[PDB]
């Protein structure tokens, strides 16, 4: 029994349908292949700073990534890097709402108000160590979905 | 790069090593000594020489007494009568640095160089197409062991291919010509 | 990418100034920059565009916009100009100050222990460096620049010059404290050069402006009308406005020679309709000349084809300031000497020069006239003469006896419009002269007033004939 | 120390051609910096530091702080006009490099092209590289170990494959140059200045008045001195490459590219070249 | 001076009779430019009240209510049942942000009592159903912006800016 | 009581980031903190720290407000946005030296408030060179990823 | 021995009839096979003549003409107009290669006198309006090259790569 | 008005007889002016046929030929071998420039035959032996520029770059 | 609008005559292009009826028939028996895709009624027999693609693939 394989295909799901462009789907995949492996080396925040620093957290892209956690008909947009990086952090942060890290409307409150996403990065990296051994499988699960599903350039 | 006063032959850079990469390099040549039937005497008492001054930094080749090194660090150094020639022959001094103050001084002694992508339609930088890459300055030296099992063919490739071997490409950015490095081999230069 | 015009022009006591402020330092000489160029040919653009939009919509757009609709031909941030200026200075090989020797060591001597001010004056044709200290030493020197005899008398009599050229002329030298020979040495020698390289005035600098064309970057939405309209602007600022430091006051003032047009389809247009100034016998040909070029891209040429893209933005009537041409005040009249006009320009445009003294009196509004059309001047509440006096002939509201009145000049009310007014160091005049030759000896006094956005419906009738009255008194 | 940042200006007076012009813009920088710190009684008090005539100087006797401002902005100029005057090139030790490079690439068995290049007007290259960064808010591409400003081989291979997209198109400019799937055929080092007729820096001035401006309300001079490659500055590189079947493009594409500008700010006509020589050494 | 009303995007449509002053003044909040909307207002700790839709409070930071902001008072039949208030401009969620506002504005906001009888139990809906949509770009984007067909041809856009870029919390109950 | 690099920086930028009230202040520090830790890898620590210093024209007020971010949590930084975003910088760089034990607040304090104590600032910087030069760089690092993620672009 | 004669491809075509050999050896130079065109030739410092086309010897670096290598003498009632020469097979101007030749190949290109009472005022000309690039498909690429379309379906691709590998410099009077 | 011949420099005295006219108007393009050589002419895809030395046009835009532009007309013994054109003065590679031009300009270069007889394949050759720089200066420098001799005692500023720029090809067949 | 024909590749010859269209227009979706058949359609839900075959209507995902989709019209006597289809050019399931449609088309395929009489048993054929393809090979690749028998005697190499990849699945009554 791995659960977080199912972890991985339902937010697999959700960010794959929130990727209209294919070179935002190709782009995720890159995202996918890389993210894993340089939180491996470098640990959980520095990734996650390098991530939230090429997301560009607008409160535009953070409402569709807030409308993600319940719509499934929402979309990401941007560039496709941006939308790429932004499709990762909603992996991240799904997973942390799951396994109830982080309390749902914690994250909701945080990604509305920009005067406490600070507060959210402070409780990450509180968490970090705890996140750092969890997430492992999920994101090598993440990643074995896209380089599976996504066709490359 | 160096910045001294009160020297009468100027320099506007300079060599700069560590004890620790001294004690690198004669581990290297004790492990060899003790897996071969190499000894490479000379090496070994010039290096011990110079690491019997470990704990202060001092100059090989020179009169510098004091020195601000890549613009950051201030030294004060002090001679030492060895002079390594056949390593450093173009008369460049040799300062030799406590590791605490080396490893600065040697890690902001490579050179950044930022590139960037021109967006060939309105021949502006394209998004994102920036970024940097760090650089071995020319006439940096590094020490290397190429080791050999006994052979029949062993013997041709240290008579016949190591004696002609002496200009090789390292590294990336070959066609930005970032990569040519010649072997001295020790052999025939200590 | 591919030559697209050439055009040979003629400079006349152009003032260019390089990171010295002169037109030649110790290390070069240049006469003409490329970057003024560029900046200037922008600047007429903005104004003639400004002009258009007048003249068919009454709306005024703010620089950040036109400059952004433009952007496809002269660059931005966002994309490379598409049109390269090469200048090219025919002489324009090395040339540099040398300050071969100047025999102080006597100076010095009169210098120590003291505090004193160290003026220079060139005129007599030997320098001599004045004291306040009361002493007058003449000093010997040799430099590599040969100042005429001409440039001396051209700056000594022009009360402009011999104005901005205070600022390179003295040193307060404090001795008292420790002070050696050889380090005043060099603070005189620097200022004597600083001093000496103001005089390297020439008359006639004659270059050629090439312009080069990128044609990668395709018709995008508009870019060949954009173009037309851009070296329409060009050759409005060579028949207006001239190159270098002051030229609202006649220096620098540009002539066309020869133009030689290399992609007809673009501007073969402009070819020939500059070919209509190698030749002007009178001064009503040249008036017709401009009013018929001003008129051509009012009405009749191109159209409002890219003013109705959404891009511009119109201005804020009391937080911004824009100049446009207004056709009707091109006074021109003939010169027959270049010098005394330029020199006489500074009774026209000075508050006690006696030729608008002799067109204006009450001097309130004369003061008026010259803060509303002679850029900024240093007026301040001493002496009456500024309260309410002047405050009243600017007044939007409350009389009609001065034919202007700023936007939102308010009586003890002032917002904004009052400072940038009366305070605003850096402001450049309304009204403008300008000198022109052709390939004839003829040579016109043209003297406009740019419209401007602060005025309220300014009386064109008035100062239209006070512009006659000034043009005749300085010429 | 301190005392080195006080003598600063006499070595760079006094070495001129020997001192590292890097680290040595970067310490003259600090007393640039705090400037009016290094004008209170802390001037070492010597007789050959440039800063004792701004003690004598007395620019504004009412306000000592709009002082000190004018004292910085003479003494910005000042700096630029000692650089541009001491730092001189000597450009033997760059012969030798080429020519024992030459030999390296021979050895290898590479046809070498070498390329000489001069300089017609004031050139800018690497404007936003850290050399002056600190004083004037622009740069020069500048090697701290060859002591000399330099041409990087990536901005030359740039203009040259831009060149050639443009007109043999893109397939053949990657059938060059290579693409995210093949190397390039060509390879270019750094172009240094091998002689000139006179100063090897100088100083310019950029000066906007509307740039990004609203209005003429907005209208102000802001005036940046800089420093620039003075003209008439020979810089010199090498082009080096195996397939013989790629040594036409870059021989015509040389000429051309170099009358167009090769640096920054050539729409107002500031890094343009002429092209030299042009030597071609088929490896036999 | 100038008063905006909220207009709430449900799947319910209150809206053929909700709003007089279609656009009343000079301007408005929500713009359509053939990019989509833009302007869009987001309201949180409230949902909907499906049946007649208006925006009840509840207190949960996940439950969001998305709607269009234009100028105009409502229906002078109201006034004992909305919640007006004022906010500078800045101080209100907007997306999809294309100009800045007038630094104070007074808005309307369809409000229903707390209704404290009944546990409120809220689950995510969305806008999908087609005829749904279009009975939405019916009844309100063409009376408050008669830009529709007249301006706006390639209203396919502005149909699936509602289709994903709207969405809410509703009630049920 | 010790804050690694990235936590130090996240709570510097806290302070920084409510304290700078207008938002193009904001976004001249994002590219403050994208250009000044390359500048200070080449042109070394100490001249980039007196450039940061000079460019923020401390004014004797930007600094009283300087100062009292280091107290409170109330204070604002105003002043040119040009010129805020590098006296935001400067407390940085400030919030560094002292949470790091190098260089003591009052010394700085001084330093930054009269001449006399500025050059002992110089001579300081290059005895504390190698321990200030180890790291800062990777704190810096972490202020600009911050910045790229937490203003937009403008 | 081996002769080819250089076909400039401008968009003005007299590129009709002034040449015979359409087969004539085994084997060409030029090829359009499975990716494209093959071993397309340039000449610098040239300049086409557009009205009757013919490379007029101009000595500007920067002009430069392309056209495509197909055997021949042309028409044989010449000798006086056209440029003849001699080439070792390796100081062409070949782009896009595939196989080289003989190390000796003659070549005849269309030229004439620089007509010196005429200011050669020279303009640069890409190849677009694709009815242009169909009809020379018919003229040339039809003409010498009517393996085209009984062999190669890759019209598309030697029709995008017209618009990428021909590019020249007229005289436009 | 205003027409000029371009005197190539090879190491071969075969440049004597090219001349017809001295100055003939007021002005020669190249200069020689107390710092050396001004205004150069580069003529690129020529080789120089040193066997009775005139330009010989070749495909390659790796051989070129440097040289100077004097005033004047080339012999009364030419119209079958010189090649004369008229070019706007842009359209000319000067090395070294150092004035301006007029903007249009008529040229005579000596012109020679491709001789497809033999493979033109042609090598490089660099002006060294200064005892030819010093002869050539009485040569060419002191039939037309009779500078050398009147004012400028500095000809060996010309010798260090005769030995070191006018380099050319040749067939050196 | 561009229109295609679908048609199903049997191993029974009743493809003979229901192509009139050849090309008419001036692009083929299905290709050979050196590597064999391109771009092929596979269609769901549809079997093979060789007596007088056509696609008969099943309901069954397991069977496919995989089909080349030409240039063509059907008969000009249709419209009674054969599906007309107009879909934007990515419902089509295509294989071995090389280029891209301009994004829209109409094609016309074989229908068949599903004669509810006879239940309907599908089986798996794969063409084999060579002979077969020998025949299928001239019956469509040489009346469709007047291309190849002028290219390649790589006909083995197109007859490998339809060996390869055309199966289908037919109704054995």
Sequence with gaps: ?153 | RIIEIDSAKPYVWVYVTTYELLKKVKLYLDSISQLSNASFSNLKNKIDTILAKEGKNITLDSDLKSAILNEDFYVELEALNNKIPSIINAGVPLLVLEDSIGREVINRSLIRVRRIRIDRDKKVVETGGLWSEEYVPMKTIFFSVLLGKESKESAIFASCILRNLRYVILGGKETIGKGIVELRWVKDVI | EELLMSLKLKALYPLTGGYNRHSINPFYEELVRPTEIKGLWRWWNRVLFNTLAYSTKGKLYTYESIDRLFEDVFGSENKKSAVRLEVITDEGNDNRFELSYVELDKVIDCLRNYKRKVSLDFIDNTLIAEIEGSTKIPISFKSNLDIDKIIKDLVHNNKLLSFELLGFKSVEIDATKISDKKILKEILRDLITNYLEYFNIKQEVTFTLNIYLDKSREHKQNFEDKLKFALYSLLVFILLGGIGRKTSRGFGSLSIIDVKCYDNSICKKIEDLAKNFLKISSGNELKSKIESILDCIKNSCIDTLYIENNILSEIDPKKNVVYFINSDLFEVKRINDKEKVLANIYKAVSSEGCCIKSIITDKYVRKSFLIAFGGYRKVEKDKGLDIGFIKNYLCETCETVSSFNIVDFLLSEGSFMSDYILQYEHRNSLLRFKLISDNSNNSYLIGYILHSSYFKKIDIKYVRCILEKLTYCVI | ?284 | ?173
Excluded: W
Aim: glycine share 4%; with cysteine.
């Design chain 5, 1 to 173: 001076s100038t008063q905006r009303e909220y207009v709430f995007i449900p799947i319910t449509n209150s809206i053929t009779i909700d709003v007089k002053i279609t656009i009343g003044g000079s301007d408005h909040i929500t713009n359509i430019d053939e990019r989509g909307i833009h302007n869009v207002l987001v309201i949180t700790g409230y949902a909907v009240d499906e049946k007649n839709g208006r925006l009840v409070p509840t207190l949960d930071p996940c439950d969001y209510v998305k709607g269009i902001l234009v100028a105009g008072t409502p229906q002078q039949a109201q006034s004992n049942d909305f919640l007006t208030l004022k906010l500078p401009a800045n101080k209100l969620y907007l997306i999809r942000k294309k100009g800045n506002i007038s630094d104070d504005l007074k808005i309307y906001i369809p409000y229903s009592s707390p209704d404290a009888r009944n546990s409120m139990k809220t689950k995510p809906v969305s806008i999908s159903d087609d005829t749904i949509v279009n009975n939405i770009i019916k009844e309100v984007f063409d009376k408050i912006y008669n830009i529709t067909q007249k301006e706006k041809v390639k209203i396919e856009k502005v149909k699936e800016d509602i289709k994903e870029l709207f969405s809410y919390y509703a009630l049920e109950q």
């Design chain 1, 1 to 153: 029994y791995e659960e977080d394989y199912k972890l991985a295909l339902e937010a697999f799901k959700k960010v794959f349908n929130a990727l209209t462009h294919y070179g935002a789907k190709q782009a995720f995949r890159s995202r996918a292949r890389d993210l894993v492996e340089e939180i491996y080396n470098s640990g959980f925040i520095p990734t996650f700073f390098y991530i939230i620093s090429k997301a560009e957290l607008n409160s535009d892209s953070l409402d569709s990534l807030i409308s993600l956690f319940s719509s499934d008909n929402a979309i990401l947009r941007g560039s496709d890097e941006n939308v790429s990086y932004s499709a990762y952090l909603f992996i991240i942060l799904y997973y942390l709402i799951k396994r109830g890290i982080i309390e749902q409307k914690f994250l909701i409150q945080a990604l509305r108000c920009e005067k406490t996403r600070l507060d959210l990065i402070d409780k990450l990296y509180n968490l970090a160590p705890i996140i750092s051994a969890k997430i492992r499988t999920y994101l090598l699960a993440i990643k074995r979905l896209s380089e599976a599903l996504i066709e490359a350039r």
């Design chain 4, 1 to 284: 120390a301190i005392d080195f940042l006080v003598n600063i200006l006499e070595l760079i007076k006094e070495k001129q051609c020997n001192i590292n012009l890097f680290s040595a813009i970067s310490l003259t920088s600090i007393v640039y910096n705090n400037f009016g710190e290094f004008l209170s009684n802390n001037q070492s008090y010597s007789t050959n530091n440039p800063l004792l005539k701004y003690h004598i100087i007395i620019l504004n006797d009412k306000n000592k702080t709009k002082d000190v401002e004018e004292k910085r902005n003479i003494f910005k100029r000042e700096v630029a006009e000692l650089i541009s005057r001491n730092f001189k090139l000597d450009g033997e030790k760059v012969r030798n490099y080429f020519d024992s490079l030459k030999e390296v690439l021979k050895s290898l068995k590479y046809t070498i092209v070498d390329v000489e290049i001069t300089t017609r007007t004031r050139a800018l290259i690497g404007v936003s590289t850290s050399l002056g960064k600190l004083i004037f808010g622009s740069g020069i591409s500048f090697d701290p170990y060859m002591n000399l400003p330099y041409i990087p081989a990536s901005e030359i291979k740039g203009i040259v494959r831009s060149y050639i997209e443009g007109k043999l198109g893109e397939q053949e400019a990657e059938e060059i140059f290579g693409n995210e799937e093949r190397e390039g055929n060509v390879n270019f080092t750094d172009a240094y200045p091998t002689r000139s007729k006179d100063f090897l820096f100088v100083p310019d001035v950029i000066t906007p008045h509307y740039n990004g401006k609203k209005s003429e309300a907005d209208a102000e001079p802001r005036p940046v001195i800089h420093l620039t490659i003075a003209p008439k500055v020979t810089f010199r590189f090498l082009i080096y490459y195996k397939r013989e079947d790629v040594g036409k493009p870059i021989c015509d594409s040389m000429p051309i590219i170099l009358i167009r500008g090769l640096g920054a700010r050539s729409s107002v006509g500031y890094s343009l070249f002429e092209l030299r020589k042009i030597e071609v050494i088929k490896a036999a």
